[PDB]
Write a protein that binds this DNA or RNA. Structure first.
Ligand SMILES: Cc1cn([C@H]2C=C[C@@H](COP(=O)(O)OP(=O)(O)OP(=O)(O)O)O2)c(=O)[nH]c1=O
Ligand SMILES: [Mg+2]
Ligand SMILES: [Mg+2]
Lengths: 412, 555
DNA sequence: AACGGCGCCCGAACAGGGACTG
DNA sequence: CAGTCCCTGTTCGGGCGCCG
């Protein structure tokens, strides 16, 4: 009894045609069981080869969850309907969410299955379930309702979501609620007991209308930044000062007031790397002045809502991972460091997967966007393992880089 | 008035703004004329082909060819112009079934649907877009023109439509027989079960009649009731499988198209025959772009071809997959960037073999290539068995630990154990993490002129040692590598080297042991001879130490 | 002389970043 | 500051194998 909101692709773009990648046995068996129930409930329908569109599908398990969740890689379809969920029916981003003491993320994607999808658009939601050893051809489906993981789903459901959350927002005017993709971000300054109590009250508001029982908690007020720091040694060698000048010279691309004159004078000649060089009176003054500039904020660095976020990650070794978020080069909106994540000292791909998920979560809370990642990994290595460790209901854009560490800029 | 078949039609459209095919016929031999007039007449009585008139302004040529070890003819329409104007279909065939993925089945039956494409109907509103005339005489009778009521062989939509229609017909039968495995590839159906031979034929007959309700015939000509079953080009036995006999051509003179077929058969044979190499053979297919050009076999390509023929002498076979046992993948290094592997569950009972000999990157090492081989095997194992095997790798745990913890990119290998079978994979040198006390410090630099391609390369040390070497036909990057090579040549066993070349530093830090660059290979040879090497980087043109001094010499 | 699927090894065309020159 | 070069990377199309 609901009129389907008309959805159109961006002008001059066809639907997604992305090949399905091989799935493990446990994931195929999970997707066959999930899709059989969804088909019995009318959420999806089987289709034929006359539909030239296709989107990859796999399954994940969220943190501390033993239940399989279907996950569609709608990244290609999302950026082909970008004028819809950003221009027509956009969701405003609250600047106070990042200031809250506690923020709980609730999976509300199951609510989208109650709204029908535009018949003229259902063909673009096509996905294919593979078979082991290619026993049977692909089993193709398309969505009859709003699909999870499609940016158009929260946009169309937003009118429905506002009416459901209206009594709770009136009951609690201080609580900030943000919706992104299949998730609901609920932030409050209440105590941990009061917060979790108010979260359960919000769950009951949704029940009176399969992952609603979970609640991933965040604390953006505890989120830290990793600035550029300079070493502090009792004695300095030629090699130490060469690395310092190399670091400060690269850092001058960000802070224009950094000088290296008095420090380069210490290296006059052709000296051995291990020769100890005592810092002169001017070198102490110049190095002290440079340590203060690195504490001062960078001039003219602010967020532009019309520009894409970019995230670079560096593998620092020993479980250490540094990252920077920016829109323009050397205009970092945020820099951070992660240490001792899951897979530390044993699995780089799991740690990198964890780091990408953390960075994306922070970007959704702070700006309401997911950044495009520059991943320090080979394409074939990432594409072999990343789905094994993915625990999020969204997927960010990424590319693959290879930058040897000439200077340890973000972690000495 | 043609009857509508029980198989649900597939709605096929065309690309907007385009019409149907209008291509003139091709003059063929009189042998093809007497081999197609009888087909269009038999298919007309059976309802597979209807006759049209002048109200269909389309035409498409069609030739024919013989079959595989048979006496029947294959009608292949040349719909290349129709395919350019027909809508795109998403292929549901995602790969090729491999016998190493089949599980143990007590009873096995292989079927083959007769007239596969000719038993599935075409879209009602699309039959008009398939017009073609048939002249009885090459230059006399104009010939009555017909159309297609089924799937033509040669149309780009015929495979996808048949594979999807066949699945919908089998879906109810598979739901009624869950314990029966049906491998469905095109028209051939692999049916297996753990039932007794008597009860197995019962369900086979039930399946043959189930398919008969939609017009799909399973004749006794290609019905296989006893091993060895010929399925997907393999010989399937109750407890083992092998590839059908592979014949390698043995010509006295070798050209280009002969080697392309030779390397192709060796790639197909390497799935069960361990230790097949095609490096030196494929190396002959470089540069020359004349398929009909004779190429003499080099001494390396001749010995490589001789060792492959001796592997194919002894008969080999693979086993089937037992999900109750683990998957094991063991890799060996064959040298020269060549890797071979075996996947098994019980020792010396290979499910399948294979090779990885891809050379990616101008500079690399054995640890990087071993990582790439592990990834290729992992993805291959997920396609065939849906799981990753435990690996047995010829690399020490300590070697791997040193590499991945120190590398700047993320890299990883799944659960694996060390197998002590030489040649072991190791890192041939390790750059120091700190400058070396007591080692001479070399400040290297190189510059070249963009126009004359002339350049200099040299160094300056803390002990006063100095060198400048003029170079001809070089680049800035080559002189930077040459400067480092000079420092390694003229230093002791322990040396500190300071450069401003991000290019040169990035190559050496990745610890390559092989390179397409002779200069890098010479650098690698020097790095192995050393006991301690510390590479440091400084920014150029900043008046930093000896780097400023050596910059004046080479520029 | 046809269609689709997968794999390999090949080369041409392309993109992207340090570094030099006007 | 642009416009090149040098160098290295990926993408893709065709050669071949094999299946139907
Ligand atoms: C071998 C082959 C096959 N096909 C298509 C057509 C029917 C299916 C199966 O072909 P087939 O089994 O060999 O012949 P088929 O038409 O089924 O007739 P039968 O020989 O089984 O009686 O794939 C094709 O288009 N080109 C080919 O070269
Ligand atoms: Mg057949
Ligand atoms: Mg230099």
């Amino acid at each position: 009894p609901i009129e389907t909101v008309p959805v159109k692709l961006k002008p001059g773009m066809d639907g997604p045609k992305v090949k399905q990648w091989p799935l493990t046995e446990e994931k195929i068996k999970a997707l066959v069981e999930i899709c059989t129930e969804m088909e019995k409930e009318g959420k999806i329908s089987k289709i034929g080869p006359e539909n030239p569109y296709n989107t990859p599908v796999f399954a994940i398990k969220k943190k501390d969850s033993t239940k399989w969740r279907k996950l569609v890689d709608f990244r290609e379809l999302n950026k082909r309907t970008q004028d819809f969920w950003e221009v027509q029916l956009g969701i405003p981003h609250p600047a106070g969410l990042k200031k809250k003491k506690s923020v709980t993320v609730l999976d509300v994607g199951d609510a989208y299955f109650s709204v029908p999808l535009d018949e003229d658009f259902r063909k673009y939601t096509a996905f294919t379930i593979p078979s082991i050893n290619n026993e049977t051809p692909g089993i193709r489906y398309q969505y009859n309702v709003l699909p999870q993981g499609w940016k158009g789903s929260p946009a169309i459901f937003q009118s429905s979501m506002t009416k459901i959350l209206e009594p709770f927002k009136k009951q609690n005017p201080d609580i900030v609620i943000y919706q992104y993709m299949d998730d609901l971000y609920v932030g409050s300054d209440l105590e941990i007991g009061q917060h979790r109590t108010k979260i359960e009250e919000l769950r009951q508001h949704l029940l009176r209308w399969p992952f609603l029982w979970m609640g991933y908690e965040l604390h953006p007020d505890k989120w830290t930044v990793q600035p550029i720091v300079l070493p502090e040694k009792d004695s300095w060698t030629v090699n130490d000062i060469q690395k310092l000048v190399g670091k400060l010279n690269w850092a001058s691309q960000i802070y224009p007031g950094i000088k290296v004159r008095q420090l380069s004078k210490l290296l006059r000649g052709t000296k051995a790397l291990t020769e100890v060089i005592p810092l002169t009176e001017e070198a102490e003054l110049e190095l002290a002045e440079n340590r203060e500039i690195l504490k001062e904020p960078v001039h003219g660095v602010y967020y532009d809502p019309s520009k894409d976020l970019i995230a670079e990650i560096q593998k620092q070794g020993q479980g250490q991972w540094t990252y920077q978020i920016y829109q323009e080069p050397f205009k970092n909106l945020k820099t951070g460091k992660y240490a001792r994540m899951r897979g530390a000292h044993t699995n780089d791909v799991k740690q990198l997967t964890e780091a990408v998920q953390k960075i994306t979560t922070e970007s959704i809370v702070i700006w309401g966007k997911t950044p495009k990642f520059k991943l320090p990994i080979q394409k074939e290595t990432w594409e072999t393992w990343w789905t094994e460790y993915w625990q999020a209901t969204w997927i960010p854009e990424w590319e693959f880089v290879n930058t040897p560490p000439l200077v340890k800029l973000w972690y000495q | 008035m043609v009857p509508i078949s029980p198989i649900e039609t597939v709605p096929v459209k065309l690309k907007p703004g385009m019409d149907g095919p209008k291509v003139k016929q091709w003059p063929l031999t009189e042998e093809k004329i007497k081999a197609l007039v009888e087909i269009c007449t038999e298919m007309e009585k059976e309802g597979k082909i209807s006759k049209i008139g002048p109200e269909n302004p389309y035409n498409t040529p069609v030739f024919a060819c013989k079959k595989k070890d048979s006496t029947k003819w294959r009608k292949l329409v040349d719909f290349r112009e129709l395919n350019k104007r027909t809508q795109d279909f998403w292929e549901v065939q995602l790969g090729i079934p491999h016998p190493a993925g089949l599980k143990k089945k007590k009873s096995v039956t292989v079927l083959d649907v007769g007239d596969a494409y000719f038993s599935v109907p075409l879209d009602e509103d699309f039959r008009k877009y398939t017009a073609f005339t048939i002249p009885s005489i090459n230059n006399e009778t104009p010939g009555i023109r017909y159309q297609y009521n089924v799937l033509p062989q040669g149309w780009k939509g015929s495979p996808a439509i048949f594979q999807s229609s066949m699945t919908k017909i089998l879906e109810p039968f598979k739901k009624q027989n869950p314990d029966i495995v049906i491998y469905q590839y095109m028209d051939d159906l692999y049916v297996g079960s753990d039932l007794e031979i008597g009860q197995h034929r019962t369900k086979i007959e039930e399946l043959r009649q189930h398919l008969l309700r939609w017009g799909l015939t399973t004749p006794d000509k290609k019905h296989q009731k006893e091993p060895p079953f010929l399925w997907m080009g393999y010989e399937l036995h109750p407890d083992k499988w092998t590839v059908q006999p592979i014949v390698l051509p043995e010509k006295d003179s070798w050209t280009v198209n002969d080697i392309q077929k030779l390397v192709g058969k060796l790639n197909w044979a390497s799935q069960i025959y361990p230790g097949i190499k095609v490096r030196q053979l494929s190396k002959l297919l470089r540069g020359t772009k004349a398929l009909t050009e004779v190429i003499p076999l080099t001494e390396e390509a001749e010995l490589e071809l001789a060792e492959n023929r001796e592997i194919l002498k002894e008969p080999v076979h693979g086993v089937y997959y037992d999900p109750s046992k683990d998957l094991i993948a063991e890799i060996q290094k064959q040298g020269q960037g060549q890797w071979t592997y075996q996947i098994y569950q019980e020792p010396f009972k290979n499910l399948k073999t294979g090779k990885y000999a891809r050379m990616r990157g101008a500079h690399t090492n054995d640890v990087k290539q071993l990582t790439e081989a592990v990834q290729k095997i992992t993805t291959e194992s997920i396609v065939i068995w849906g799981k990753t095997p435990k690996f047995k790798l010829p690399i020490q745990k300590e070697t791997w630990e040193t590499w991945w913890t120190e590398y700047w990119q993320a890299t990883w290998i799944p659960e694996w154990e060390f197998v002590n079978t030489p040649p072991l994979v190791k890192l041939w040198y390790q750059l120091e993490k700190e400058p070396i006390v007591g080692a001479e410090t070399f400040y290297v630099d190189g510059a070249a002129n963009r126009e004359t391609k002339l350049g200099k390369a040299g160094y300056v040390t803390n002990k006063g040692r100095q060198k400048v070497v003029p170079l001809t036909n070089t680049t800035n990057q080559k002189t930077e590598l040459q400067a480092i090579y000079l420092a390694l040549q003229d230093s002791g066993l322990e040396v500190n080297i300071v450069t401003d070349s991000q290019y040169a530093l990035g190559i050496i830090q990745a610890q390559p042991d092989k390179s397409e660059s002779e200069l890098v290979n010479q650098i690698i040879e020097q790095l192995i001879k050393k006991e301690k090497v510390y590479l440091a980087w400084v920014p150029a043109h900043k008046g930093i130490g000896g780097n400023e001094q050596v910059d004046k010499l080479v520029s």
